Amino acid sequence: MVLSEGEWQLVLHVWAKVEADVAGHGQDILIRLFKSHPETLEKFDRVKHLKTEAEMKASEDLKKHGVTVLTALGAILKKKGHHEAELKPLAQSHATKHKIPIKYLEFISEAIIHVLHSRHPGNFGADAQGAMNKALELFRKDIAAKYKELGYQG
Ligand code: HEM
User: Fold this and answer.
1) Residue pair 124/14 in contact by the 8 Å Cβ criterion
2) Within 6 Å (CB) of ligand 1, which residues are found?
3) Long-range contacts made by residues 62-69, C-beta under 8 angstroms, separation at least 24?
4) DSSP per residue, 52-67
5) Which residue is closest in CA terms to ligand 1's atom 23?
6) Which of 51, 57, 81, 91 has the highest CB neighbour number within 10 Å of its CB?
7) What topology does CATH give the domain 1-154?
8) Which family does this protein fall into?
9) Ligand 1 atom at minimal distance to the Cα of residue 73
10) What b/e sequence results for 18-31 when a residue is b if at least 16 CB atoms lie within 10 Å of its CB, and e otherwise?
11) What are the extents of the domains in the chain?
12) Backbone angles phi, psi at 47, to 5 degrees
């Protein structure tokens, strides 16, 4: 797939608002993920044990994870499709070490869209949501292909 410049602009315009508060958005997104799809929490040996949303909010380790995920995703989106170098190490750890099925990347994509929609309604109308979904589909498609080369296509 290929986004147009206009679609990239919509994506990077709402992302610039996310970056005003990386840790807060990280928290919202992962908590939304873990509430919606509790199986995903099992992948994090560090936060596995957390039982409630209050515990999740209070967790410093969860908030670090969120910042790590969003910073890596931000660097990828800012490449505007030319992200082959950033993807390689990421596809290798998630295929071989963490073992994150593509289905889980779909779930977090849903969580990202949900949280942007709540927090940024004026900058996240239909066309901006369409452009973000396209960017995240592109990301999942390129990851899935690398998974296959690495022997996982999990
Ligand atoms: C937008 C998607 C994602 C991005 C860009 C992302 C990025 C990263 C980065 C940069 C790290 C640390 C370096 C490394 O281990 O490669 C990491 C670690 C990890 N990721 Fe991902 N990730 C994403 C989605 C997921 C999802 C959906 C899950 C699980 C349901 C997941 C589970 C983990 C785990 C278990 C770690 C290691 C945590 C630890 O330090 O103990 N990731 N991720």
Assistant:
1) yes
2) 40, 43-44, 46, 65, 68-69, 72-73, 90, 93-94, 98, 100, 104-105, 108
3) 62/27, 62/30, 62/31, 63/23, 63/26, 63/27, 65/26, 65/30, 66/22, 66/23, 66/25, 66/26, 66/27, 66/29, 66/30, 67/22, 67/23, 67/26, 68/26, 69/26, 69/29, 69/30, 69/108
4) SHHHHHH-HHHHHHHH
5) 69
6) 91
7) Globin-like (1.10.490)
8) Belongs to the globin family.
9) 5
10) beeebeebbbbbbb
11) 1-154
12) -115, -5
Q: Which of 146, 154, 143, 72 is nearest to 112 (CA)?
A: 72
Amino acid letter, residue 16: A
- Four-residue CA torsion sign, 6, 8, 11, 15: negative
Phi, psi for 112 (deg, rounded to 5): -70, -50
Number of the ligand 1 atom closest to the C-alpha atom of 107: 27
Atom 9 of ligand 1, residue of closest alpha carbon: 69
Gap between the Cα atoms of 69 and 64, Å rounded = 9
